[PDB]
Motif scaffolding. Structure first.
Motif, PDB file in Angstrom:
ATOM      1  N   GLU A 206       0.861  -1.208   0.000  1.00  7.98           N
ATOM      2  CA  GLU A 206       0.000   0.000   0.000  1.00  7.98           C
ATOM      3  C   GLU A 206       0.869   1.220   0.000  1.00  7.98           C
ATOM      4  OE1 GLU A 206      -2.912   0.777   3.157  1.00  7.98           O
ATOM      5  OE2 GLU A 206      -3.547   2.618   2.168  1.00  7.98           O
TER       6      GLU A 206
ATOM      7  N   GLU B 202      -2.126  -1.865   6.834  1.00  6.35           N
ATOM      8  CA  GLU B 202      -2.806  -0.811   6.064  1.00  6.35           C
ATOM      9  C   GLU B 202      -2.465   0.511   6.720  1.00  6.35           C
ATOM     10  OE1 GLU B 202      -7.110  -1.109   5.714  1.00  6.35           O
ATOM     11  OE2 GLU B 202      -6.961  -3.095   4.765  1.00  6.35           O
TER      12      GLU B 202
ATOM     13  N   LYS C 117      -6.854   6.282   7.053  1.00  6.31           N
ATOM     14  CA  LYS C 117      -7.454   6.725   5.757  1.00  6.31           C
ATOM     15  C   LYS C 117      -7.610   8.220   5.678  1.00  6.31           C
ATOM     16  CE  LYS C 117      -9.528   2.731   4.412  1.00  6.31           C
ATOM     17  NZ  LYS C 117      -9.994   1.518   5.048  1.00  6.31           N
TER      18      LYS C 117
ATOM     19  N   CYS D 126      -8.402  -9.332   8.044  1.00  8.82           N
ATOM     20  CA  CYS D 126      -7.625  -8.104   7.745  1.00  8.82           C
ATOM     21  C   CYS D 126      -8.260  -6.971   8.535  1.00  8.82           C
ATOM     22  CB  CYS D 126      -7.651  -7.734   6.240  1.00  8.82           C
ATOM     23  SG  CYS D 126      -6.775  -8.990   5.247  1.00  8.82           S
TER      24      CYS D 126
ATOM     25  N   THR E 248      -8.850  -3.159   9.637  1.00  9.71           N
ATOM     26  CA  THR E 248      -8.979  -1.968   8.779  1.00  9.71           C
ATOM     27  C   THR E 248      -9.657  -0.806   9.535  1.00  9.71           C
ATOM     28  OG1 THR E 248      -9.716  -1.292   6.546  1.00  9.71           O
ATOM     29  CG2 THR E 248     -11.102  -2.828   7.713  1.00  9.71           C
TER      30      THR E 248
ATOM     31  N   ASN F 147     -12.076  -5.554  12.996  1.00  8.57           N
ATOM     32  CA  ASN F 147     -11.065  -6.581  13.171  1.00  8.57           C
ATOM     33  C   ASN F 147     -11.831  -7.852  13.500  1.00  8.57           C
ATOM     34  OD1 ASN F 147      -8.482  -7.824  13.523  1.00  8.57           O
ATOM     35  ND2 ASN F 147      -9.034  -7.955  15.686  1.00  8.57           N
TER      36      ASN F 147
ATOM     37  N   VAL G  83     -14.970  -5.154   5.150  1.00  2.00           N
ATOM     38  CA  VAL G  83     -14.407  -3.801   4.953  1.00  2.00           C
ATOM     39  C   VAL G  83     -15.479  -2.778   5.290  1.00  2.00           C
ATOM     40  CG1 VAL G  83     -12.775  -4.618   3.193  1.00  2.00           C
ATOM     41  CG2 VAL G  83     -14.987  -3.720   2.479  1.00  2.00           C
TER      42      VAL G  83
END
Ligand SMILES: CC(C)(Cc1ccccc1)c1cc2ccccc2c2nccn12
Ligand SMILES: CC(C)(Cc1ccccc1)c1cc2ccccc2c2nccn12
Length: 301
Positions: free
Chosen positions: A63, A104, A107, A148, A150, A160, A186
């Motif tokens: 990423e 990751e 954001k 994963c 996020t 999670n 997600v």
């Protein structure tokens, strides 16, 4: 989906691309390889522009940061398993995340990393590298095999292992029921919904909004405007995905296209203007002596 370009790895009897993401520089794709290199390619000519050995095992994820200055990578069995790299002037390692098998960025403001180790999420500060938080509640775990962790678009919630966490309180807010073995979910880019396998859940009410059967076992990617969602389905160097990807309208989850590219998929990603889809496709089966992947660029777009 019109094909626009194809290329294989240079400098290589066989082509070992494993994962990709567009760089902050337009026209340039970053790709990981099965020998743990990070390479920069001209997506139209297929020219290799740069190469760095980030890991001594295959790259399984990368990423780049939006501002061009940082990159996360995850490898296969190497220690450390994940790392953060600086890409301003000189390519160097800033931090590593010893047993996190996936990482990751945050954001809204990309000043944190979130790593996954099995059922456990770890949040790190980018500057110090320090572990700020461990999110794990053994009573709420789903034990998803492809967990994963996020952040949500505002960096104040984490998903999670099928559990919704509040980052500021480090408290679990809600556990979503387990309905599959692998996919953990997600956040939709609208901030209001979560997509966990075939289930779409409202974050304000926890009602089920939609059932999307065709998302079963799919790794979901959104385009940058958040209007289209891309699904590649886990396989039943083994490919992580089968040979078809699906696209859905991100506002009503209606199917737009099913594309069978007839080669197992390793990765897919869009450019920030959402003109292109870059797909890593394997020309070989998992039985081959060696990997033979290509990067195919499609105009969507
Ligand atoms: C930071 C920079 C020098 C930028 C640069 C240098 C030459 C051509 C284009 C861009 C560089 C970036 C990079 C990005 C991905 C994979 C490897 C590298 C890499 N390996 C040594 C050099 N680099
Ligand atoms: C496990 C994963 C991160 C894909 C995934 C699956 C389920 C849920 C979220 C993410 C992944 C694994 C891999 C293994 C070998 C070679 C390449 C890759 C690779 N290339 C892009 C991603 N990957």
């Amino acid at each position: 989906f019109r094909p626009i370009s194809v290329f294989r790895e240079a400098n290589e009897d066989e082509s070992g691309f494993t994962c990709c993401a567009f760089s902050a520089r337009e026209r340039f794709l970053m790709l990981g390889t099965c020998t743990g290199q990070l390479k920069l390619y001209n997506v139209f000519s297929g020219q290799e522009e740069a190469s760095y050995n980030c890991h001594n095992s295959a790259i399984t994820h990368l990423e780049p940061s939006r501002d061009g200055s940082l990159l996360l990578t995850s490898a296969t069995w190497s220690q450390p398993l994940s790392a953060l790299w600086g890409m301003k002037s000189v390519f160097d390692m800033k931090h590593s995340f010893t047993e996190d098998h996936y990482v990751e960025f945050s954001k809204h403001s990309q000043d944190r990393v979130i790593g996954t180790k099995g059922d456990i999420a770890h949040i790190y500060d980018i500057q110090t590298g320090n572990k700020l938080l461990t999110l794990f509640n053994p009573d709420l775990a789903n034990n998803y095999k492809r967990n994963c962790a996020t952040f949500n678009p505002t960096d104040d919630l984490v998903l999670n292992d099928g559990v919704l966490w509040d980052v500021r309180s480090a408290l679990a807010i809600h556990k979503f029921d387990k309905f599959n073995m692998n996919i953990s979910g997600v956040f939709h880019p609208n901030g209001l919904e979560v997509i966990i396998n075939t289930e779409i859940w409202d974050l304000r009410t926890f009602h089920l909004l939609h059932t999307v059967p065709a998302l079963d076992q799919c790794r979901v990617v959104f385009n940058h405007t958040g209007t289209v969602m891309y699904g590649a389905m886990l396989q039943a160097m083994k490919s992580p995905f089968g040979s078809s990807f699906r696209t859905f309208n991100a506002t009503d989850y209606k199917p737009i296209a099913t594309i069978d590219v007839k080669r197992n998929i390793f990765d897919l990603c869009t450019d920030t203007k959402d003109c292109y889809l870059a797909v890593i496709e394997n020309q070989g089966s998992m039985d081959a002596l060696n990997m033979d992947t290509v990067c195919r660029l499609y105009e969507v777009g």
